[PDB]
Amino acid sequence: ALAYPGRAVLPTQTKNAQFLSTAIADRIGRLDRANLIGGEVSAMVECME
Amino acid sequence: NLFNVARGNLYLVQTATNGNWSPMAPVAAPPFVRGGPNVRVVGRFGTI
């Protein structure tokens, strides 16, 4: 929960929460993993965190 | 509905009554529609 600030449950309008409420919801997690061989481990994965 | 799955959104109005009640098939009109007058969709986080 500490590496993904856009993923937090926001209860009341805290001074944190009025900034986290402006977090865009697709700027989280992996983006486009570029694996070659199907079944083997991937090459490099672009992620936002 | 045979498989214990109901469709459609769920209202939660407080309706104190003594009469007939059937929440599955309401004969009366819906309390309001999703985009009606003086209705408001709550944000994204549910933040009070």
Side-chain angles (χ1 to χ4, degrees):
Chain A
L2 183 134
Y4 291 111
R7 216 182 143 268
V9 160
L10 260 53
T12 91
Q13 187 89 340
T14 12
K15 211 176 177 56
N16 266 335
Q18 54 179 156
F19 159 71
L20 254 57
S21 177
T22 59
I24 312 294
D26 53 298
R27 317 274 189 85
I28 171 181
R30 84 119 160 87
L31 248 43
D32 290 86
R33 190 143 77 257
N35 54 334
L36 270 71
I37 301 300
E40 215 180 353
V41 68
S42 157
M44 52 173 179
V45 33
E46 163 169 1
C47 66
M48 307 196 53
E49 62 203 6
Chain B
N1 319 283
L2 265 66
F3 289 10
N4 308 36
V5 173
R7 80 252 300 179
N9 29 19
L10 161 83
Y11 294 96
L12 289 189
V13 320
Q14 176 241 36
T15 148
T17 178
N18 202 350
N20 291 14
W21 191 237
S22 61
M24 299 260 90
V27 198
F32 51 91
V33 82
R34 195 216 190 269
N38 204 93
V39 83
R40 42 261 308 247
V41 199
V42 33
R44 193 174 91 87
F45 301 92
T47 307
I48 206 67

